[PDB]
Amino acid sequence: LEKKEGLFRKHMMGKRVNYAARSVISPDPNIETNEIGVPPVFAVKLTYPEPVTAYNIAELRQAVINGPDKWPGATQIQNEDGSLVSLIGMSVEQRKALANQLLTPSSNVSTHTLNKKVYRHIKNRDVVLMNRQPTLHKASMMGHKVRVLPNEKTLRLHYANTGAYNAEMNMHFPQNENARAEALNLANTDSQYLTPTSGSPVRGLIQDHISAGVWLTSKDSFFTREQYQQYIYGCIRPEDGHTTRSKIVTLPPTIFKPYPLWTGKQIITTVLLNVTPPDMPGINLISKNKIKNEYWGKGSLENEVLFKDGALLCGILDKSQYGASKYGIVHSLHEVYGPEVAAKVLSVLGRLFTNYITATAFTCGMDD
């Protein structure tokens, strides 16, 4: 009840919380933009109280067997009310023949509705909140899906979120399905592609991928059938649900004789063709990039990009086209197909430029 350290601004307008964690951030392009890097130490630590139904009995009948030992597991059970039978001080044999019968027969009718509940380790499907102080704007806090990496202990986020978080940070893990739905549908990063300050986008690839795009989409790029197919598959990975076509589709080579060849712009075109949902026309777009034509010599019209029915035909990508800029190609793709498709496109571009830059690296030297 004091000026600035009073009971209000210290225990009523803000509190310490349970089921939360804090660490430092290690960027990782190899994860989906709506996902986060959860070390296995957190996985055995953070648990979620989830009741046992008649459809997910086995999925938890083995999580109890795992226990705190191996992820995914079960820290403890919540038999009836309270009675938190712990599993840390339990043998594997003890957990066997005991946690097998989670759906016990009718014992008593005093509480005949709440069957049973089992705390379980955090799995990939879940969602957590991420906050980086100072939380200057609401965009500084979002939600992300779980990606349990059996690797070293630090948090991993995609490079796109750097523009939003302005990037160590904290993690919040709710236990109620209402909060789960709120995070996954209202607080999820994909739903927040734009900022209410001026309506401009804030999320996109930043520096390495920008340079990679500039080098790849230039007219001086050509790829054989092997390279083209490899880039497309590595960028897409349809088996992870990226595309619903259930079979990747390619494009005719831009050159047949003397031998087949493709082009980086054609790579972008087939990327869009794969990610764009079927039964839908392609994107038509006209805009300009940040590079003047004269930087490519006479007779070049590369300053202006010209999409047509979901196919790049002129110009090159840039920070303006993709990244964090208004009226860009990614911005228009958002406008047309919703935010989810734009987020998937950004993730696919991040994966592509990463794989491409490994094949031909980018470097600055004293000669420059």
Binding site: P281, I286, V336
Partner: protein, 177 residues
Amino acid sequence: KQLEGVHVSYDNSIRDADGTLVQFMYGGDAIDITKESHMTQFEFCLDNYYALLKKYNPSALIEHLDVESALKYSKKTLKYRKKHSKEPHYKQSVKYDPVLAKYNPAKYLGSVSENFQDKLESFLDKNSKGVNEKKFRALMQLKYMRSLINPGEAVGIIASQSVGEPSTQMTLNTNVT
């Protein structure tokens, strides 16, 4: 702390928990500041027309709304405005209110802001044409209806953040404060 409670009502006005109104509209347009980047991007909207038509599924958006009344009111209002857009601010009367005040902008099609109508007409007055203007206007108005703030937003909180957070990097150094 001052605006922790102000939120968008189910009605177009903005009311706190007590219900006191701050403003009947949201800036006079009721358009969500997020889903409004390409409201005036008429060329891009015209392109990918079929994609936009598929995303704003018009087959399902006819059994729960009507258009003709609001459209007629808007036509009369624009006609009168164009008739008397020359005389000064203090000599003008109010023969007809702007459409948003008259009708629920989110339930009656064609219920759009004044400047939106002016810019849409200015763009459509360019010839060069699927390309039917009678359906292009319908799609644009459907998008405008779909670009409205949901009841229950944290506007006010959003306004405070949009004023404060950008001010951190607003100015450092070099008469008026």
